[PDB]
Design a protein around this ligand. Structure first.
Ligand SMILES: O=C(O)CCC(=O)C(=O)O
Ligand SMILES: O=C(O)CCC(=O)C(=O)O
Ligand SMILES: [Zn+2]
Ligand SMILES: [Zn+2]
Lengths: 13, 342, 342, 13
């Protein structure tokens, strides 16, 4: 789970 | 020779001269080598995407119907939704997350967001040029269902066949957003990385894209994860502070200049710096952001760079949560390391 | 005046002179204040344990039947199990975890463990003194069911009534072990902390116990968690390296000298340095190690020092596991912080 | 769970 990742980008969710 | 950067400008068809020239590119302190510019049909291209390395594809027809877009056509057809338009008195449009600003009271953004209608954006833009002003605007708005019908018909004409097969072949998640970016010549988006995959489709004008692999994390000094500028480099590429950022002396880029019709694969976690060519007029781009593949249910060694980056982000996030306040994250990390691991 | 250290030595009953004197204490670079020495019946004592602060209790009768123990009585009664006996040519018996040594090939313990029968321990000890040798031994063995019957009867005579009410009142877990420690005069156990609660019951001879609160973590520089010397201070108290360990200049201790009948509450996570008085003859102690209370199902702020220590340990442990190798923990942490949080 | 703790002491488990 330490290699899990979310999906943040240069734009509002 | 091998740090050839963007290469010799390509010649436009019908002897219309070089598409741009070297004087239109800002100058930086680090060297760069070219990103490969290939045909969509070329196995090497497929090999690059498969390995999560950048490639400029020249003939995908991804956004063929958008190629006719310009301000008039869009003012006429884009509808009456609100568009986020950033305003600044510097060329650099540093991205910041407004939801994180409450925790960093002393963060003072150099760029301001104004919501406005497309026609207002074109007016404001027109006003500037006419009174010869220095302010800059960058419109950055996700495409959504308020857009008019011709834009809908354009979008639907995108090469979904080609890009859906990419999404499938790579095992990526869902398409999350298509950002429409419209910028004034000389605008820069400073270096950052994204936690999604990106096919970056250039429509109007020229952009120089400088990329760095995930393994340059140590040279690019991202802001703390709870800072508004999470994922963005702290380094001012126009005036690098080598005392704070010594390893920016070791940074090496991959670069290209994309124009109308080109699509740049920006692989997830790859740093990128994006500039609209000096004296190039306005630029338009639309991007395509996919969630990446699920991580293996079990991890294989040696770990890749991007997996260490994911780890580092999760440690900062968990610390922020456990300590009850993001500003304690640094003091704790320092106490952890000093005299013990440094 | 208020850094009074251990205080003026107490006078033994029946005018048998001071129990020890100041010349028997090693000298260190930091100051200290006294640990309170109280009666078991004294509400302040109860208040101290409740707050997880150290207190020497003078009249608990915890190990009353062990007070007659000496080498002869124990050689005669302790049975024929094996006893771990550490051997060294320095006064410092730095604890190390043998299961962690595989990962730190370059760790060279200054002390060696030899398994041997109690009678062999007494012989070896006798040999040394007679040939006037310099080697030192420290026997450190958990008490278990191989011990002879009188030892069983002694143990059973301990003040379980008093200590079980402590365990209950504090909400502690199970008693896990009773270590029997038998040491030669001048032996030192260098500073470390334990992740259990400890009632430290002195039986024969005198020990000076120097404690530091969990909030001195930054001054005491524990080894990395995956190192054999996890929980132990890196600092050589006899020759402190202020360049590597600058904050050891700020360290402040709590000290006491315990003798026969005294019990020292060493609260979980409190650092302690333990020395058997110079020219004091042999020492015997038996400790009582309890798991601490379960943590609240939810955490209240502000967090306490020992909870930050727990956090730091869990971050190191998780990193070691995720990276697949403990030796990568430091490089990752450093990459995390440099130019970002320091 | 980051505040959870095990029970290590200066003696073999
Ligand atoms: O073109 C720009 O200015 C920024 C685009 C970008 O960073 C992205 O699409 O991920
Ligand atoms: O007395 C000694 O030398 C060490 C005892 C100790 O560290 C303990 O009981 O936790
Ligand atoms: Zn981006
Ligand atoms: Zn201890």
């Amino acid at each position: 789970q330490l290699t899990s990742y979310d999906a943040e980008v240069n734009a509002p969710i | 020779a091998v740090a050839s950067g963007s290469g010799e400008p390509r010649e436009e068809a019908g002897a219309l001269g070089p598409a741009w020239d070297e004087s239109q590119l800002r100058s930086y302190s680090f060297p760069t080598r070219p990103i490969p510019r290939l045909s969509q049909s070329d196995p090497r291209a497929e090999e690059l995407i498969e390995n999560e390395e950048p490639v400029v594809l020249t003939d995908t027809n991804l956004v063929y119907p958008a190629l006719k877009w310009d301000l008039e056509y869009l003012q006429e057809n884009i509808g009456n939704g609100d568009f986020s338009v950033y305003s600044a008195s510097t060329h650099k449009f540093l991205y910041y997350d407004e939801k994180k600003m409450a925790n960093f009271q002393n963060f003072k953004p150099r760029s301001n967001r104004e919501e406005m209608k497309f026609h207002e954006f074109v007016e404001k833009l027109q006003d500037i040029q006419q009174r010869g002003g220095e302010e800059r605007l960058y419109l950055q708005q996700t495409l959504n269902d308020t857009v008019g019908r011709k834009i809908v018909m354009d979008f639907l004409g995108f090469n979904w066949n080609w890009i859906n097969k990419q999404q499938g072949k790579r095992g990526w998640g869902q398409l999350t957003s298509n950002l429409l970016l419209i910028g004034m010549e000389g605008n820069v988006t400073p270096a950052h990385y994204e936690e999604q995959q990106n096919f970056f489709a250039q429509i109007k004008g020229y952009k120089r894209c400088i990329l760095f692999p995930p393994d340059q994390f140590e040279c690019l000094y991202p802001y703390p994860v709870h800072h508004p500028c999470d994922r963005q480099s702290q380094v001012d590429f126009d005036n690098p502070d080598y005392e704070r950022f010594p390893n920016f002396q070791n940074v090496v880029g991959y670069e290209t200049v994309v124009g109308p019709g080109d699509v740049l694969y920006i692989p997830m976690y790859w740093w990128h710096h994006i500039e609209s060519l000096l004296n190039g007029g306005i630029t338009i781009t639309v991007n395509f952001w996919y969630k990446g593949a699920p991580t293996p249910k079990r991890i294989e060694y040696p770990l890749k760079a991007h997996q260490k980056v994911a780890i580092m982000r999760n440690i900062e996030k968990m610390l922020g949560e456990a300590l009850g306040n993001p500003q304690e994250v640094g003091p704790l990390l320092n106490t952890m390391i000093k005299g013990r691991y440094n």
